[PDB]
């Protein structure tokens, strides 16, 4: 049932009954005779030896040991010759293109009883799984091993043939799509864990792309109704057209990751504390601490914190009827265990909303879930078996491992979590270069947009909304101005209207005047972004304008300095950040989480968040904790409301709105001259992180201290670096800044 | 660790692995025997002869002195015959692609010990490198000789290749860019004496092209700070990012060289003095006067003229407490010799800017610069050595190219 298949049998056949039929013909005319000797030459030949000889001949091999005597035979034989090499010219081509035409990649994916796969598809090359498929098959993850079936329409690169020739054991490919009901029964989505659709970051219209991704998931959903799916978005609005699925049951395991929303979020938290983008980058991947003597002092120092993961557990019987402060100083000083977030709502059946860091009235009830930040899941066991009784005099927490005799005219938003103002046209918000030079801007934050006129959109607002939330009084808003093009701005502008305290200043980033106008040398954070189109040319020049940018700034100088302004970086490629920093040591193989710029929070790439995609696999409350950590909020009540095309809207808000107004938020504090500076000499970091929990009920995750060890000094370079949750026994020093979960505003 | 050469070892290996098999198969069908014939019709056949046999049938040539004469052995040689051209027909496109996947342009720079180089990236063709490569190797330069080591992502044309023939002596090619800290080390750029960036003079957009020079630099600056750089720019405002550069200093001798300023320039000149561009344009190039009985008279006058150069020379203490205009009198009288510029402020150490034609107030003194210009390099020396009172009655310019009774 082939085309090709009855084309070729059809000349075989056609080859084989021509060749018996020249076979037929020899013999007759061999053990005939000849008419002009009267058949008196006549050879004795068989059947089978007439065949081998003309085999032999046709073959163009030729042997010597039978030939054709007769005259008749002779002329025969150059007749077949001639004839049949005129047949083979005029034969080869069609046999040439048929034997290259089966696909190698089809077949059926065959399942083991009790082995468990997803299936992955969408946009399959190398860049876009080489992350993923390095978190997904790590080591260090436990011992359940679950295959990946990658199905695409398309045949493989070389290096991604090289990635799947390499995790032989693990990855399977195929040719399809998930357009087709029949390639959905070759993978076996009807026994399938989960599916996994990706996107193309760097593509043209992005809307266009979520329209092909979400009529994949219509299609899948289609297929089969209660399948888990995990999609890959870009933009943001089109977030609420997967609620119009009938089957996308958010309550069951589907999950939307925006690309767009995350990355924005973590400039924005950078942006309020600085370095937070690297720590939270470095919470949500599967890394490994392995140590090498090459490696500088406070390259360990950061290298151990790299490794630290975060898990879930449930809290064991001793935690029952103790407040959230009580738990997690126990949990630190006994456990040597960090307790973030906890389940709040588990006994009334109400979705169980996650509380981080809750005040001294929230108890801790029976069978609740806690989220912890470990170095490995072993240690987090120590939590469930842990017996107030039997553990009381155990010193070692090796031992606890293993469990003992068991038995002000304001106006918000309508959800009241986010700053509002009524709309505005642009121009009451436009200014120049005396405008802005008059108002006196001063720790503000300075966006730096390198957009053309037709330029796909970023979303400016998934950078501005977590810089309006409710929990910031009114005068501890930072003033934000962007920089760059104005007609990407008149498009842009629709959805940036209503957050109060925004400036524009048209012109370009690279010029010198637009930079001191807008007082970059008293600013608090300038954010470099680029929404210009990628991948037309060498991959080493696509971040000109950043790199130009950022080298512009930090040589510029200002009156009483340029080298101080704090900057961060959006790259496109990961491989340009070896161009950022000069005191470091490039090296080509190095990954980007252990370059220095990236160690100092100085640069971000997308490419850390292709990590997101597994993880939410296997956690399905690290996508919620990550979201209400780096938005501030964003409910999907508030989806809800923006999904009706009617934009933001609000106003003063009743009184039980306003208790929205206390949840927790990051921050960052300094040892120097606060109440809690004691520390800062010869303290160590346990004892500040219980006298923080127990006195201001604070609750600090990590430190962020100067690179350079002779700190009385201050040699030029003074960068910092992050390290996340450092042991009990650190030392401390004068100069180093926390990062805290700071409570009640 | 090539997966072309990892598919060539495996495939020549399944094919000697597969020839030997038939190798065997034929050798155990022929001194077996013959069923029908109660084998009553084998014949001797050692295994290297029937090796022999099989590639000699298998390499479509054909002999005649060994053959299968049991009808087993016969049948298997056209199996053989058979599968085997099958084979070779899905065979052979896979094998002339690797054969033609390596690429010729490849390996590491080696230099001699005493030899210098200097790396020239960027934009390579044909047209932005004939003139330079015709300057920089020209004969009339001293005997110091440096090589160039190009070094470039692309394969050369036909006349570029012709080029690189010619001057296969002093010409190197590379495949690879600047922008990779491992091409950096098969050019030798931590021993190389300077590196020269050339553009696209008729792009497109020049800001992209000007900004992909930059981005050159700064990887350039990037892998070794302390190398000489000379950048070839297209507009002027791209001029001020290089000095964003840390590494970027002029005064240890990097430069850029800016298309449009330098020919808009030498135009505005000719407007206030006509025929000014060509007196420019002929005193910054290397030329030979080599009249032919061909010119006229007017053509060998101006080809003279052509083949006057500019040097520099550090002037005899001779003109010491010597105003400009005497010293330039002097110099064109006795030493037949042009002198155009001065370094007015070597001994303050103010980077000594140049002073052109100044006037009587400026007065050298000890071991100051000169900028002459004159036929060859050869008659510069003359202001070296040059004393006042041995040379008093010397008449001959030649005599004067010698020093006499130097302390
Ligand atoms: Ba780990
Ligand atoms: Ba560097
Ligand atoms: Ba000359
Ligand atoms: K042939």
Same mark, same amino acid.
């Given at each position: ?434 405008? =802005?030079?008059?108002?006196? $801007? ?8 390198? /957009?053309? !006129?037709?330029? @796909? *959109? +970023? ?86 304008? =950043?790199?130009?940018?950022? $080298? ?8 009483? /300095?340029? !080298?101080?302004? @704090? *900057? +961060? ?86 009184? =039980? ?89």
């Amino acid at each position: 049932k082939t085309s090709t298949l009855i084309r070729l049998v059809q000349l075989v056949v056609s080859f084989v009954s021509l060749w018996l039929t020249a076979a037929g013909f020899l013999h007759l005319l061999e053990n005939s005779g000849d008419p002009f000797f009267d058949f008196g030459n006549a050879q004795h030949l068989t059947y089978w030896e007439c065949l081998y000889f003309l085999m032999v001949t046709m073959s163009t091999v030729g042997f010597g040991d039978i030939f054709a005597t007769t005259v008749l035979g002779r002329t025969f034989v150059v007749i077949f010759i001639m004839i049949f090499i005129g047949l083979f010219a005029s034969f080869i081509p069609e046999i040439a293109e048929i034997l290259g035409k089966r696909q190698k990649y089809g077949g059926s994916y065959k399942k083991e009883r009790g082995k468990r796969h997803v299936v992955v598809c969408g946009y399959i090359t190398f860049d876009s799984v080489s992350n993923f498929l390095k978190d997904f098959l790590h080591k260090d993850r436990e011992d359940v091993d679950v295959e990946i079936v990658f199905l695409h329409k398309g045949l493989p690169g070389l290096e991604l043939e090289g990635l799947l020739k390499r995790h032989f054991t693990q990855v399977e490919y195929f040719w399809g799509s998930v357009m087709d009901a029949n390639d959905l029964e070759r993978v076996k989505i009807q026994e399938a864990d989960a599916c996994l659709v990706l996107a193309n970051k760097y593509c043209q219209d992005p809307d266009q792309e979520d329209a092909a991704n979400i009529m994949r998931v219509i299609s899948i959903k289609n297929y089969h109704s209660d399948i888990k799916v995990i999609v890959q978005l870009l933009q943001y609005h089109n977030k609420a057209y997967l609620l119009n699925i009938p089957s996308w049951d958010w309550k069951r395991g589907d999950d939307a990751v925006c690309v767009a929303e995350l990355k924005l979020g973590f400039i924005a938290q950078s942006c309020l504390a600085p370095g937070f983008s690297t720590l939270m980058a470095n919470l949500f991947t599967m890394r490994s601490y392995k140590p090498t003597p090459e490696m500088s002092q406070w390259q360990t120092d950061y290298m151990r914190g790299t490794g630290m993961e975060m898990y879930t557990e449930y809290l064991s019987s001793a935690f029952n009827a103790l407040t959230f402060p009580e738990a997690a100083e126990l949990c630190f000083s006994k456990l040597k265990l960090l307790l973030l977030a906890i389940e709040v709502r588990q006994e009334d059946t109400r979705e169980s909303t996650l509380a981080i860091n809750p005040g001294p009235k929230v108890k801790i009830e029976n069978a609740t879930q806690g989220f912890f930040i470990a170095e490995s899941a072993e240690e987090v066991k120590r939590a469930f078996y842990y017996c107030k009784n039997c553990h009381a005099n155990v010193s070692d927490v090796r031992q606890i491992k293993k469990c003992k005799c068991r038995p002000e005219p304001r106006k918000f938003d309508s959800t009241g979590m986010f700053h509002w103002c009524p709309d505005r046209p642009l121009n009451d918000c436009l200014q120049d270069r005396s405008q =802005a030079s008059a108002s006196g $801007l001063r720790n503000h934050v300075v966006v730096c947009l390198f /957009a053309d !006129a037709a330029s @796909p *959109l +970023i979303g400016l607002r998934n950078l501005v909304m977590p810089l309006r939330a409710s929990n910031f009084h009114y005068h501890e808003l930072k003033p934000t101005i962007i920089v760059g093009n104005l007609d990407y701005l008149h498009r842009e502008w629709k959805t940036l209207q209503n957050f109060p305290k925004l400036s524009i200043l048209p012109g370009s980033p690279l010029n010198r005047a637009n930079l001191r106008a807008v007082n970059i040398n008293l600013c608090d954070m300038c954010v470099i972004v680029s929404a210009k189109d990628r991948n037309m040319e060498d991959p080493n020049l696509v971040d000109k304008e =950043a790199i130009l940018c950022s $080298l512009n700034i930090k040589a510029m100088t200002f009156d009483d /300095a340029g !080298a101080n302004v @704090p *900057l +961060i970086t959006e790259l496109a490629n990961d491989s340009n950040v070896q161009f950022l920093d000069q005191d470091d040591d490039d090296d080509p193989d190095t990954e980007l989480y252990m370059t220095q710029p990236f160690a100092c929070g100085t640069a971000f790439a997308v490419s850390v968040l292709d990590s997101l995609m597994s993880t939410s696999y296997f956690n399905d409350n690290a996508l919620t904790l990550i979201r209400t950590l780096i938005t501030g909020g964003a409910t999907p009540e508030l989806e809800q409301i923006l999904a009706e095309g009617a934009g933001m809207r609000g106003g003063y808000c009743s009184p =039980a709105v306003l208790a929205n107004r206390d949840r927790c938020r990051v921050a960052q504090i300094s040892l120097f001259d606060g109440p809690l500076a004691q520390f800062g000499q010869g303290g160590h970091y346990g004892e500040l992180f219980v006298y923080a929990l127990r006195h201001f009920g604070i609750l600090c995750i990590g430190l962020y201290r100067f690179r350079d060890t002779n700190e009385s000094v201050r040699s030029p370079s003074s960068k910092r670096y992050v390290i996340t949750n450092p042991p009990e026994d650190f030392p401390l020093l004068p100069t180093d800044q926390v990062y805290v979960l700071t409570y009640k505003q």
